[PDB]
Amino acid sequence: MLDCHVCAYNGDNCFNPMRCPAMVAYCMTTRTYYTPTRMKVSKSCVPRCFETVYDGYSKHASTTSCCQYDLCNG
Numbered sequence: 001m002l003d004c005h006v007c008a009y010n011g012d013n014c015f016n017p018m019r020c021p022a023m024v025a026y027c028m029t030t031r032t033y034y035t036p037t038r039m040k041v042s043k044s045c046v047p048r049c050f051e052t053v054y055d056g057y058s059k060h061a062s063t064t065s066c067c068q069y070d071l072c073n074g
Contacts (some may be wrong), residue, residue: 005073008042017071020045026066029073033061043073046062 004027007016013031022023024045032040041051067073 002068003070004044004067005029005043006045007050008040010038010040012039013041014043015074016043017074018045023047027070027073029065031063031065045071 001019002025003017003019005014005016006018007014024047026046026049027043028046028049029043030041032042034040049064051066052062052064054060054062065073
């Protein structure tokens with residue numbers, strides 16, 4: 001059992017603590033960056049979350065974080 005913030009907003013970071021189902025055991029958070037005046041964020045409960053790294057040719061305006069701590073993505 002684990003609790004994470006499940007929501008999505010076009011700004012800094014939304015807040016919505018919700019307990020994951022009897023299958024998920026990790027928190028995912030994808031913070032995207034479109035413009036210097038507008039950003040987007042997304043959080044939810046997932047079983048497996050990988051870290052999105054970009055530093056070469058692809059767009060590095062996005063960074064996905066993963067954790068297993070309660071409200072870790074708060």
